[PDB]
Amino acid sequence: GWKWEQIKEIIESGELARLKRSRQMTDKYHEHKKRTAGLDMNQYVLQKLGWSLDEPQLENAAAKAFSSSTLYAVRANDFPYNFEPGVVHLVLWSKVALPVHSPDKAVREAARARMNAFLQAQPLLRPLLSSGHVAWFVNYPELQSVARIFHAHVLLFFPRERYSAEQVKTTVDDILSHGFEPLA
Ligand SMILES: [Zn+2]
């Protein structure tokens, strides 16, 4: 799998298609694809996250992305990409889209700045941020699924010489249980 420095270089160059699953994980992803071939996965995800129109509305319509914990959700990626041991592949879903690949440089930079501020503000990521061991990307339209719901790939690096696999499990379970904290 990709080493952390390679991951950072790929994200920086925008060559996101290079971030691929292993042959085997590609096989499993293929079988899950067979299973969901009869579904609109946008509606499925909305349903699972509690964001369907059926649900109540703790909204103000104009709420800023990440301004309230009801507006986002972090999950472990069930079919992670092929990264070196210690890299944890999470998915951050947001009810509010962030136009991070807009042709408008002002809009794109502003949307990226918001995502960055959100992740930087997270106490549960503090030592990883201090280490440069948090990265994120949003797959382009020609690469993504579930295009009606914003989601970012959030990668956390726990080097093997710094965290046992069991300590990684513990910390990630902690993050997913607590969730991320909102940002005004
Ligand atoms: Zn949640």
Author numbering: 16 to 199
List sentences quoted exactly from the publication behind this structure.
Despite the lack of sequence homology to any protein in the PDB, a DALI16 search of YPL067C found that it is structurally similar to members of the widely conserved superfamily of histidine triad (HIT) proteins.
Crystals of this protein diffracted to 1.9 Å resolution. As a result, the top pruned Foldit structure was the overall highest-quality structure produced in the competition as measured by geometry, density fit and steric clashes. The superiority of the top Foldit structure can be attributed to better side-chain conformations than those in the top structure produced by the trained crystallographers. Its most notable distinguishing structural characteristic is an open channel not found in other HIT proteins.
